Design a binder for this molecule. Sequence first.
Ligand SMILES: CC(C)CCC[C@@H](C)[C@H]1CC[C@H]2[C@@H]3CC=C4C[C@@H](O)CC[C@]4(C)[C@H]3CC[C@]12C
Ligand SMILES: CC(C)CCC[C@@H](C)[C@H]1CC[C@H]2[C@@H]3CC=C4C[C@@H](O)CC[C@]4(C)[C@H]3CC[C@]12C
Ligand SMILES: CC(C)CCC[C@@H](C)[C@H]1CC[C@H]2[C@@H]3CC=C4C[C@@H](O)CC[C@]4(C)[C@H]3CC[C@]12C
Ligand SMILES: CCCc1cc2c(=O)c(-c3nc(C)cs3)c(C)oc2cc1OC(C)=O
Ligand code: NA
Length: 382
Amino acid sequence: APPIMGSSVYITVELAIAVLAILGNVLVCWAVWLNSNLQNVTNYFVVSLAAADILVGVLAIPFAITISTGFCAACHGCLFIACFVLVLAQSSIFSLLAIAIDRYIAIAIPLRYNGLVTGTRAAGIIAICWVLSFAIGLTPMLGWNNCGQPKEGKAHSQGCGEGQVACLFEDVVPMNYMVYFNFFACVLVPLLLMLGVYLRIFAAARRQLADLEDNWETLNDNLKVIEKADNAAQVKDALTKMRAAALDAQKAGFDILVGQIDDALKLANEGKVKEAQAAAEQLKTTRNAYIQKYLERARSTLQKEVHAAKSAAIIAGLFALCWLPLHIINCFTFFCPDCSHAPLWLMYLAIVLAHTNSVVNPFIYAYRIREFRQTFRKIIRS
Ligand SMILES: CC(C)CCC[C@@H](C)[C@H]1CC[C@H]2[C@@H]3CC=C4C[C@@H](O)CC[C@]4(C)[C@H]3CC[C@]12C
Ligand SMILES: CC(C)CCC[C@@H](C)[C@H]1CC[C@H]2[C@@H]3CC=C4C[C@@H](O)CC[C@]4(C)[C@H]3CC[C@]12C
Ligand SMILES: CC(C)CCC[C@@H](C)[C@H]1CC[C@H]2[C@@H]3CC=C4C[C@@H](O)CC[C@]4(C)[C@H]3CC[C@]12C
Ligand SMILES: CCCc1cc2c(=O)c(-c3nc(C)cs3)c(C)oc2cc1OC(C)=O
Ligand code: NA
């Protein structure tokens, strides 16, 4: 069956993917430019990630279409077109890892976040990461390639010239580089690291949203204890505890609260039980009017952070889902030489799926993040 029909389907699909990758990601980048509420450090990594996807459509996809033809080319030029996508995938990994870390900093140490994670430090990190991405992805160009052992029988059959090879990914890029260096070290390890960062993010969230609840219960149970108490010393016990739990909430209305606990304690230390109890009853007014509003705000903010962290995790998860099959196929090719090579149709499918990852991010932002969604609408409307 003529190779141009099988190759026609693959190519059309690649072109559809490129179109969509470019479109969606230009809109991400355009949204961040226009909306100042989307101008934060997290979103600069998002933009870097969008840039990489734009380049998959503009460059990586045309390169892959090109190399699918097996056209004659100087080996090192062939190399470049085979490996450029690795640079883009690496850049993406760095961006995803940074987003995970950024979100972890925001939830673990919100006090120090703004001064630690600035836009200036973020742009420097992005630049460094792009340089590193070029180094990792283009490592084969530094000598780890099969250009030294060309398939001359395959090159002579297609009438290639001197110094040229039939340009095919697996003929030029060593599988050991693909499996051990690229997959294990540069993809798998950073993905496992991301998994770990997200676990810590979700656990820290759980611990804080438990802690908020505990402190509130403490305030309410110590009120009851004070309400039915025998003497002044019991009242003093329950307000000494209450005081400490109000000062931790203030670090993590409060002027009034501590003050009122203090009023009650002085009375309690003078042996006046009924007066201490009545003064402690006034604490209820403060709890309703201020403290409960703080508990519910703080809770809301933590829920917003968990949601935003889930959205970022989904993105990282989708990268793994889209890229893993191609990596897994490479493992079979490398580790199992007695196994028949995965068919060309499957290679095409795995490649296309990897490329499809460059289309997905804009949809996740639209479905999961209000500010992006609202800005996408205005850009589209106008
Ligand atoms: C959830 C996602 C990440 C998992 C996807 C796993 C895919 C990539 C796995 C599942 C079954 C696997 C196939 C099982 C059997 C063979 C026959 C062998 O001669 C070549 C590899 C090949 C064809 C494997 C290629 C990879 C494969 C298709
Ligand atoms: C979920 C994460 C850890 C994904 C990474 C899992 C990868 C590395 C695993 C999953 C399935 C595994 C393959 C299963 C079967 C074979 C056939 C055997 O003859 C050689 C090893 C080989 C080819 C394995 C290599 C490693 C492999 C591809
Ligand atoms: C994190 C998880 C998913 C990794 C799982 C990797 C598993 C599937 C890998 C790790 C070590 C691998 C084995 C290592 C050695 C051999 C000998 C070879 O003659 C046949 C395949 C076989 C028997 C492999 C089968 C797949 C294997 C068991
Ligand atoms: C059809 C597009 C060209 C092409 C690209 C690739 C390719 O991009 C990879 C990659 N694997 C990873 C992990 C990242 S990229 C592999 C293993 O085989 C390929 C084989 C290819 O087709 C030929 C016949 O040359
Ligand atoms: Na990407």
